[PDB]
C-alpha cells in the first residue's frame, strides 16, 4: 500500500505508539485563504514536501500556469505563457518560461491542460521552488 521504500515513511509531528485497553493525521491550513482538500485529511499518503500534510511554508509569489508534462515522481512541468513588449515595433511577441512544480497526491485526479495556481516556497530540489495550491481543470469536465 505505502512504504515500498528502504526507510519507514511517517510524519515527524504524530506519535503512533499509544497503549491499548486508526492513527491520527497532521493537516494544516496554508494561509491567504486556500481550501485544504478532503484528500489531505482522509488520505493515508506520507509526503515530506506537501503544503497541507508535509513540511513546507508557502510565502512570496503566487503564480498561475497550465500543466504540460506529468511523467516525473510527485513533480509536474507547467507552462507560463506571456507577451513581451518591444518599444521600437510597437507590438508584443509570445514567450514562455515553463517551470517544474511539486504536486501533492491530495490532487488525486489531474490531466494535462488543467490550470494550477502555484505558491512560492524554499527550494525543494535543484529546479523546484513551487507547490500546486489548487487545481482548476479546463473546459469539458465530463465524457
Amino acid at each position: 500500500d505505502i512504504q515500498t521504500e528502504r526507510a519507514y515513511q511517517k510524519q515527524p509531528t504524530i506519535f503512533q505508539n499509544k497503549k491499548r485497553v486508526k492513527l491520527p493525521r497532521y493537516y494544516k491550513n496554508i494561509g491567504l485563504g486556500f481550501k485544504t482538500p478532503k484528500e489531505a485529511i482522509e488520505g493515508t499518503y506520507i509526503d515530506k514536501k506537501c503544503p497541507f500534510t508535509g513540511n513546507v511554508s508557502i510565502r512570496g509569489r503566487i503564480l498561475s500556469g497550465v500543466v504540460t508534462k506529468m511523467k516525473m515522481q510527485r513533480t509536474i512541468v507547467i507552462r507560463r505563457d506571456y507577451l513581451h513588449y518591444i518599444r521600437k515595433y510597437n507590438r508584443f511577441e509570445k514567450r514562455h518560461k515553463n517551470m517544474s512544480v511539486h504536486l501533492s497526491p491530495c490532487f488525486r485526479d489531474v490531466q494535462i491542460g488543467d490550470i494550477v495556481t502555484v505558491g512560492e516556497c524554499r527550494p525543494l530540489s535543484k529546479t523546484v521552488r513551487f507547490n500546486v495550491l489548487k487545481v482548476t481543470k479546463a473546459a469539458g469536465t465530463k465524457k
Binding site: 494561509g31 491567504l32 485563504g33 510565502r59 503566487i62
Partner: protein
Amino acid sequence: ARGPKKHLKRVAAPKHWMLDKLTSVFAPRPSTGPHKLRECLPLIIFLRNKLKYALTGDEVKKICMQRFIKIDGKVRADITYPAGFMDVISIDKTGENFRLIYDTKGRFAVHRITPEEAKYKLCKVRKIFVGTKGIPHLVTHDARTIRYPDPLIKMNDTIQIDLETGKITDFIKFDTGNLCMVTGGANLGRIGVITNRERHPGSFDVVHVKDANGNSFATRLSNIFVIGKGNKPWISLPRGKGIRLTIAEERDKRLAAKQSSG
C-alpha cells in the same frame, strides 16, 4: 567586498542631509546604532551645517569630547552617532532641547522644545516578544526592549516613555481617527488622521491618511507613526505642522513674505 564597508561617498549619501558635493569625496558614515543608515541624522551633520557651532569636523570632536551633548538623557561622545526619529538631543550648558521631527519636505527640522517636553519621547512598537520565563518583552523602533509591558500594548501601537527610568508613562493604540506622521515614502513628514488600513494578506498593508486641510494620501503601514488622538498631538509640532502646501501655494506665500515684511 569580503566584509563590512566603512566609508560613505558624499554623492551616494542619503538625500535629506543636503551635503554639497564640491567639499569632499566622503560623508559621515553613521556608526552602527539604534536607527538605520538611510533614515537617521549623524551628530556631526546636525552640529556642523544646521546649527553652525562647528565650522569643521575637529570642532564637533572638541564639543563632544567635553560631553555637553546628551542624546535621550544619555551622554553620547561619538560624532557619527545615528540620532533617528523622535530621539531628543539635549545641550545641558546652553539650556536648549531639540526633538528630531520630520519637516514638510521630508528633512530633519531644527525644532526646539521646553525642558518639560525633553524628559519624555514617543516610540512605535516594532514587535512584542515572550522572554525566558513568560516575561512579555516589547521592542520599539529605537531598539528599546521594555519588559513587562501592559497586555493591551500590541504590535503597531505607540508608547510615551520617560527617559530617566525607561518605563512606559502612557500609550496610544492604533485607532482610525488618531493623528499620525508618515516617516518614509513620498509623503515623508505629513500629519493626518487614519480613515482605513487596507488588509492585504501576505503583502504590505496600506493606510489612507487625511490631513487637516482635507487631503487624502495613502502610505504603507511601515512608515505610519501614530502621535496622538483626533486633532491634538502628544508632541510639539514644527512650523507648518505637516500640511504639505503645494508648489504654486508656496510661491503665493513667498510672494507675500518678501512683499509685506518686504
